[PDB]
């Protein structure tokens with residue numbers, strides 16, 4: 235670890251929208267805001283006008299553009315885009331001070347992909363080539379950056395979040411000691427596709443959810459800066475909501491609150507954080523039979539929703555059909571180290587996380603936990 239002073243505070247976002255970093259593409263450099271997504275593996279940028287884009291990548295104005303003469307078509311569950319592959323020179327101005335040639339998906343058509351008012355014009359997929367489109371031979375941006383420079387094979391994310399635009403830091407090539415307090419605890423990257431991890435125990439205010447730990451990782455668990463919610467498999471979600479309801483029973487909320495469909499509001503400044511429980515996930519450690527525990531607050535899983543005398547919030551723990559997703563609701567408590575070189579993900583208490591005078595997010599260990607390999611879904 236050390237000081238990476240140029241990359242501190244290089245992330246921005248609209249509350250409720252994703253975190254982006256400024257990048258440049260082409261010669262002379264064209265500036266774009268790029269969504270930071272550890273849940274995907276393509277670098278793709280708007281490259282034709284769109285009602286939601288106020289600027290885009292103009293290939294004909296870049297002397298260093300090279301046309302791969304191949305298309306790429308990418309449908310998601312919600313939304314889709316189509317693009318033309320090529321390469322160009324790419325920099326991150328508040329970044330590692332190096333310029334690399336990378337594959338770029340130039341997006342020429344799209345539907346429900348760009349978000350009105352989000353202020354980003356492309357997406358930086360930071361996961362591994364296995365899930366790149368159209369196939370794993372399309373080298374992702376971070377793979378190219380490391381191969382072409384001496385940047386260490388690691389990046390770290392501090393997503394700060396709101397209580398006003400949000401901010402944070404993406405440290406490319408290192409770990410900035412000023413962005414966390416306490417110890418960094420590492421969990422193995424189980425497999426290099428998404429950033430897949432293994433959860434071995436779940437507590438609500440210290441009360442064990444008491445499920446077969448395989449349920450926590452069915453069919454996977456990933457760390458995803460491109461998702462807001464903490465998303466839990468159906469059986470785990472139902473158990474967690476029941477327990478969170480009971481711990482907060484001093485106040486009653488309509489069923490639609492717990493489904494994320496309705497806001498809950500309190501008089502400005504009187505949100506009763508202390509009646510809601512903390513949520514702890516225990517992650518497999520690097521040592522045989524050891525785990526560690528990360529703990530978030532209601533300040534993370536109750537999302538502020540602004541509107542021009544009340545503070546109103548949406549519940550941001552929701553049901554998944556594709557395994558656990560540790561999204562911004564998890565990441566905003568922590569400084570998260572994606573240590574690709576050593577195949578591990580580090581968590582430490584974030585120096586910017588939102589909390590109150592009496593409770594803080596936490597990272598603690600070690601805990602004796604047996605048969606942790608049985609928690610992984612084959």
Ligand SMILES: C[C@]1(c2cc(NC(=O)c3ncc(Cl)cc3Cl)ccc2F)N=C(N)CO[C@H]1C(F)(F)F
Nearest residue numbers: 250251252253273274310311458459460461462562
């Ligand atoms: C590819 C994908 C994706 C994610 C986003 N994320 C956001 O906009 C966002 N990010 C962070 C926060 Cl805090 C809030 C928001 Cl609202 C946007 C476009 C996009 F294409 N990446 C994922 N990891 C999961 O969703 C995927 C899906 F395609 F299905 F949308």
